[model samples]
Target: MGSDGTWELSVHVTDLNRDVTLRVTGEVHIGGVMLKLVEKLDVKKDWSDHALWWEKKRTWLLKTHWTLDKCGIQADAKLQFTPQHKLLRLQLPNMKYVKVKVNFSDRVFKAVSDICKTFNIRHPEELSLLKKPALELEPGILAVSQPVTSPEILAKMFKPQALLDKAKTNQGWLDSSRSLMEQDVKENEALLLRFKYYSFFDLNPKYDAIRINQLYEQAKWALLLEEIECTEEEMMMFAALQYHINKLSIMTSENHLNNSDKEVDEVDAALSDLEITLEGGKTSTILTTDVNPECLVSPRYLKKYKSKQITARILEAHQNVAQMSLIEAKMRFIQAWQSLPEFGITHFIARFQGGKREELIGIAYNRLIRMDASTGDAIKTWRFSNMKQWNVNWEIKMVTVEFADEVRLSFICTEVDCKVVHEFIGGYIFLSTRAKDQNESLDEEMFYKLTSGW
Candidate 1:
């Protein structure tokens, strides 16, 4: 479209035995399109961060900018941004564009993980997956399916403005946590700040809505996954440095409700007297004297679980298609359910908790539904109750869960195949799953027998 003719290039397989020369036929660049030499290329963005909370609503931000140092050959370039992968592939008609693309895609920019965390900048993979992950997987990254909770949810959850004004709070611990991330982004820093212990959407999109949504979605996904696989080791390590405020809250509640101070002193004296006379058994876990449910969910896992509850939960996981705090444990349950009649997927199940699941189900049938339905992209639906209508028998359950420190997730049929929806794996999905479409259930007992491994 430039001074050049309709310059066209197409790539295909290259078999050594087959002779070929794919040629480009276009007006030549008399400028020589010579290789330019410079230090490197740099990219800046003015988009909404893919991290941070706007709540469940999409984040808003700026467009991305690329600055290529004169290194690669200079060529007139036109950019094509792929929405699917957030890939910005370049077709250089001029050497200038080559330098820009090479600088960004090449090894030099590979170490931008820190920049990503601090500035809320999003790269191809993170942006792509966060937008919607039932589609693909980013290795060693937490991926989510659907996120209902949003920024506004948090906004409403906390009474920060009112509380701060009422107390004229001097130390802004939570405010400082957010500020710490903001400063990191401004400085183009890569430092990991511990001001807030959670990895919930920590990116610095320069206030662009779409981008901000992406960052928050990605961050929240990571935190949810942490819910499943975040180990007591991570919890202990996390607690040692910053103290999980919730756990501290638990400690406080225990004191007020039970005359815990006197009890602690008495217990301490008893232990000392025993130490003077003999040795005592030791352990890394703790048990609460206070009757609080949160303690049960504590990552510390100090509370002793009853034998019946443990067995029931383990058994429940294998049959019902719900989620527990433990991921591997969830998969183990799915394996068992897979063998039963009506069971199909060998992975995560999708449950339409509120009812919007119907539309999401339409998405499962054929991905890439028209972004807007009223204009013609809308999918069809029927409440017929058959496979075509969304079968209830194949769906996963949403019954009550045991294990006070645990969880209860929904279950449903797979979207297409039984294999676990791609992105979620161990220790991810603070709580998440993708859909698997219609398929017959497997033999429950046999499935469990096969999956049983310590």
Candidate 2:
């Protein structure tokens, strides 16, 4: 984007060291004068958390896209960086002056394998730099906590007598206290093991990306999907398993299964109630009309006694009416509704009015809109609701209509801008009809023919 003569750019370069245009590529997340280098190149480590780590190798690539402003020198494009995806701006402060700086750093991969280890982590051909950092193993990784007391661990590691005695015997013992004892010994051991494998607190350092994740998944499957029943070796492992299970049950309230004193525990429950009625009733006419964007039904009543209200939807969708008439009208509704602002209505509802006819309505507050084919937008808008507080009312409006069955429909949107009127917009309209039907004195026969007693 430009206004003045100065052009600008902002980008953050990561994983940078002494190298000549290192093969750099990941995702170019660029949008409107802004660019974000979320994941760094080369190491491909976990950098989702924007941790603040500034060191020799972890500085940002800050640059400017202007020249002849900062000390009579041309602005360098490399020293540019963008935060929050907003970068690369240009404002002509003067005809010959500009100020821009890009911030970037090579700090994205510092969480895993240090510099030296990262060099060897990849294939030989992929790296040519030799001065990489060394990897240091940290504490708290793979370090198991406390005494190992799992059934599997006890069976294999503890004496035979201890293993048998440790097992929870009978329903009450097993249900209430059996599993709790086993978990007591597992946490300590896991912690030690974690430290041995180079653990980090928040981020996964040894980001083998594919390989690391795969190994983790495979190891878990080996432990969980074992076919054989609990053996002595498995019993020793049970101590840790028991601890983990205890933690889970405590978190989710699963400990009640064993309490012998109570017949049943009472559970707290709340019930919400609502009432529903439909005022739209059944439409009695073939809404041989098509509008843009699907229309919707608002759940509010407009005015004191109007009883119902609906507005138009904004978004144009292609209509495929079986009959040849409503094809144009359907397309208009989709387009017009899609262009409206602040309204999110997307569809209209049509009621089947018996043979060869139907009626459509909207869900907006005091609004009824019909697509006008000639103009290609909402032509008819009916506002039946007027209230001081709009939110306190329910609205059901019409956006589009279509003819079905053996009959075809042909109607046009009456709104202006027929070309883009179907983009997305909502309008309203209402009308009274002079339609008739043949009940032919079924009421007359019921009252008069039986009046012979008079």
Candidate 3:
């Protein structure tokens, strides 16, 4: 303690990337300290837009009226002085929006890291930023027939194209190399924060239930939108896994209520109840029905209806994993999906040089795969180990891959930019090179070095 009952406190100003130690008294209000910080640091932001973050406690000190002692600030305490000058809204997969403070000079990677910090996400490498599709409104129909409340209804009313464009276009992806100002992103504009790479093995429900659940919802929507190509059997399996994960929570909650009256007979009765619920129409809806009225069933499977078979398999799978904990069930769900060849793959529309048939190029964690666009079957694959070097030609929108075996293949990106395909490859490679335990800090400079040629 100082002679006047003041002590030293460290404040790390994130925007300016500097640290300053100030003498503060316990009797002073937090707001007073904030004003002092603004003046001392020469921050251009309004004082009210500034807040202090206590990293050790993982809480924001927002009670400006509280005294430093009351808010539990002690001598030699360290806090983050963050400026909330610019607000950026990020749309989650669950149709909710989260706002985070950003600077015009901040890059996309910085925003992504902020979002991960906000959500306590462990794996920042799996996520990316994208632009939200433009909202469409009916002309001359200013008012709705009924009051809109739910996010689902609001999404349908405002951004119907988002549902269709997710599967059809790659135009909305934001370049992480650029800053928000360079990209022309406005304040309060909503952008997408989603999993760019689906590495199931890296997902840990215990540490990150939020991200795992968000990924589960996105996977379901992708399946429903026909964005992911799946065989009939694989589709049925996915439906079964979805049904199991959803029903597991219901079953466990009901069991919790009957914990005091547990008996063999009661347990058997609950299991039978589960069977009846699974056999009902809900299973069929989850398996074959699209909740969105505008979505048409793909013509590929329109001639056949296998509801009975699908439900039977779903029930059998559910029974097999009936005793599993929710975490185990989720792990199983992820493992099952990750087994598919198309899982964790980013697809591009491309064609082989001098070939008339269009091809689907898939960039995955460790390989590049060429698939028949019409049938979604793998025609050829080149593991990253076999890849000697790759190059992108911006003038002609072409990508060439050379192998250690002295074989070369060039692809002409028809529907997307060659830079996009090149970046996907580099991004996946960067992810693959990350530490297996994820204990080390992210080295973004390494990513630049890995993709230096591009």
Candidate 4:
């Protein structure tokens, strides 16, 4: 121990694999002690990333403002030094990625919560983090598979899909029970942030405008990828709505640009008025205003349509929707898309009832649809309400479903494990069974408890 008020503390630096005793005063802040340690050890890590773990108390000394004495640190007390936050890369629906800072011991749920915060998403419970595929196909595959009627409009309105196929085959969902580091997630590894549960009615643009827009883009691409079957009319309507939204965005940005200079001039005029009022020693009421404008403005280029008839329909739809705000238009688009029979369906490559040829198994919230692999037509659909039981054979990667009528069917998954299908079906059932009124209050732990038995 040092003389006077100084106390010696033993700190084990886990990353450096070394132990060091540091001299500190009782009145010194933990942050100051950490700084001293960093200088003495010559470590390049940021001070904010360093945490002192007290094994005896089974807690982390996270309050950097607290004095050493306040943290219960005494002479020769043992503590572990570790990095608190690690950088994680999250891939969004539009193929764009975001970097989030998370604790090393943080669970997948925590990481997802951080991502939701970044995107200003209110419904984080509906989202999950899945491992990104090692390789992704070019976005041009969407054009090849399905011919786009308004290519210019689609290109101008949306940023960018083969991403869906890759997503389907590689379900690499992160386990919630383990920390990211324990699950072998390296720093900066890209993970897909996807909507695990789709409830269009629950989407509120006021709180989740960015999220809703992203999901709309994802749903549109999913239709183009043929992951979800859509009628020709529905596809045309979606394209038209997208065109309308893009036009509205452009108009809004241009208006903001034109009005910004006028706003500044008005502010100067108001300031002069306030100065005159102050000189006159008279009380004046001041008006305050708040305006949030879009920053990015696109060139006002008119899109060329392939057919005059299609152009007429698009214009008609645009006129009908032109009065609504951008958020409202987006909600309308999503609401229309959600009306499709297989709106939130997840497709898998599987063979049914020992069939030699493969078929598509579309797992949705309410039912399971079997579709023709080549034609993308639904052969049969079994509602979850009619499902009596289902089980997975892990060794063979096969799933057997028993309907309420006692008719059993088996599916052999070609690309993914059978459990993926089972869990999705179970998860949807769990989500559907949740108390509608308690949605806001329900936490991630509650979700796990509700589905743990399944």
Candidate 5:
């Protein structure tokens, strides 16, 4: 970041691979300059959400009040601009991708942590940042010209549950920078030798360089492994688990899951609806049919269509694929953990209350996910519908899970039969136990920390 007053800024349009020189003072706003550039370059009228790309940071210039200096633009400095949609993508549980208009500012860490919270990714330490490919200008040298990627790119590249680590690292840098700034010059200057020895890729420069690679191994083993045992299907299953867990947290926080007649019916309906019968076994898990999302209309009515006509059909289709993939990943996770000598299993009871509704006769349930690790990589996952109902309102079972640093569990509730034949209430809840808080129940501290309501 530069000083408070701006002078000259060389704006590079990466999309066009050209530079547009701008001479602006601190008095003018950066948004005004972007609009001026849009007009001067004859860019499309609707393309107003221009973003500035600095190292590990992307700042949107669409906000009205920010000045050039405030955006860290200074004399003789270069900044890159591209449309928001061009740089990032948001992934949905149903396998949909969408663009988002947001204020990134220079606080990418804060913005990303807030996003993680939105996606139900409880911890940010699970994410790993990768370097974006760049072009090096030389006559004979060769370079890989890959798409621009950053910590933010992980949100779209991987499932939300996996988007944790780098956000933690980023915040560490911010804290370290501030911490060192406040230290005495003599002491802080002395520490620079140790800091300078650290890896440039590391979030906190104060950490030792050699040992950081070990941390990267556990946190980012996917990138490290040349052959991956896990697939997108497995990742999606865990992501869906996190998504359902988030929904449950929100419901709990609202103090609305009081097992009231109407709410219980809704939850039970939604629960039964969660497990869709996926067609085509291992050969072709995702059905090849007319249900393709591309056939849907505008974004305005997408949600309506999803809720009305194709809601059950589409969700079931995806859940089918998710179930199969989740099973495969679970085996791999268990296999890896079982290699350890101390591996063990424990059985416990999770009570889910579904108040009496006369029409709700019998019930079916699916254990949506059973993740064994904090980052959700190691695990067990199995979903069985048509589960025998010991009783109508109460679904009871002793869930057995492998021992790990942490454990996660998710269950889906479905009406055994409905009068109209939907056979679904679309209800589900996810619970996890951490080593630090193993003495207490999963619900006591998990939801409290998640949607703290602060």
Candidate 6:
């Protein structure tokens, strides 16, 4: 209690980097309240950063109109030190606080992308951004579901860490990164240096941990979406530049590894053949490769170079089966299997047989299926099978494949094997039915005619 009508308020300021506490009485200037907090803390943290956050109400304190109690300050009410930049701060299901630091101009998708990559969040549509009001008269930006149209305005309202000035040259950016190494909080500046690359202007945060080329692709798309007038041709032009820069980085790094001791010798050389010169005509500092175009191989391990190239080939196949308007593939496969029983086909008992495939020691077998150009039929058939000294009762190996031809009956096969010899120990039984075209519905007459082994 105070001399007039005032009470003590316990304010705790937490930066996640560290925490601070302050005690004040009556109505006090937000700046004054922060002033006491600043004196109690060890760092030069700003007073504006020590502002009150109403967690339960999901609101930010914008004014000091009410006296202590009326302003929701009680004997011991807990308030958060949610200075701006912490966007939609939520305690994750795992109890870890999900804090994303955002620049005003950064898109909501950018923040969502980072959260997904860092924490492995699967459903990002459940995520949103909450605007923190600056004053009582104004509403915090109405952004949730649909992205806020104006990112720059949101940025000004939340004074995040100063972004790299656009005026700096590429060399200037590198020099500042080195300077950051000496500073305490500016470590892990990998993100800041990327901003120098033209390809990284609108990059998604999800790609922060990926390779440079992948990062460029996401960033390029972001810029493309943000700027209405950007054309695909312009996007591709920047992509080519991005690719060369990545190669340049790799080339520069190779120079360091091959020439770790001193200047380049005859046996080892810097990138003498790299012809791409830097902007501003700074060719003296430009690194080039002298390694011959064809003779580029590691002397110690000759096999390493051959093994390097495409790390992966992303294959998109058989996806149309999922997108079709027909019944699911699994259900259709089951239906085909059930029809086998109705035909009195009991040799194999099913479309596919288990424990039928066999392999022998020191044996290799290859078969070529020749299909007609106009109609899919065997022009010349070749297959390998047999166990020179095995029982004839053993089943042979069989391969099965299905296709949807307009509207036709399904098909299945039940025959297969392996042996060093090109002679037959057994043979395969091929079956085809009038499976209706995938695009057409089933007809009673056509269905009966196809299954008329009845």
Residue range with the least summed lDDT across 10 consecutive positions in model 3: 139-148
Please state the error at residue 268 of candidate 1 in Å: 14
What is the per-residue lDDT of model 2 for residues 170-259, given as tens digits with 9 covering 90 to 100?
A: 101101111111112121111101111111112222333222222232222222222112332232232222222222222223224321
In candidate 6, clashing pairs total 25
Q: Write the per-residue lDDT of candidate 6 for residues 182-216, one digit (tens) a residue.
A: 12222112122121111112222232212222223
- lDDT at 367, model 2: 40
Q: Sorted on TM-score, highest at the top, how do the candidates line up?
A: 4, 3, 5, 6, 1, 2
Residue-wise C-alpha lDDT for candidate 3, range 332-389, written one tens digit per residue:
6566666765677766778885668667777788888887776667788888878888
The whole-model lDDT of each prediction reads 0.23, 0.22, 0.61, 0.61, 0.32, 0.29
> Clash number for model 1?
72
Stretches off by above 4 angstroms in model 2 are 1-59, 62-80, 84-222, 225-232, 247-454
Across 233-339, the per-residue lDDT of candidate 5 in tens digits comes to: 34333223222322322332322322111121133223333245443243322223233321221222243454344434444434533333222322333234333
Clashes of each: 72, 150, 0, 0, 19, 25
Q: Is candidate 5 or candidate 6 better by lDDT?
A: 5
Report how far residue 364 has shifted in candidate 2, in Å. Answer: 68
Stretch of 10 with least lDDT, candidate 6: 137-146
**Model 1: lDDT of residue 353:** 48
Q: Over 4 Å off in model 6, which ranges?
A: 1-5, 15-32, 35-49, 55-59, 62-76, 80-215, 219-454
What does candidate 3 score on TM? 0.61
**TM accuracy, model 5:** 0.28
Per-candidate RMSD, Å: 21.2, 33.9, 13.6, 13.7, 24.4, 27.2
- Model 3 residue 180 lDDT score: 65
Worst 10 residues of 2 by lDDT: 168-177
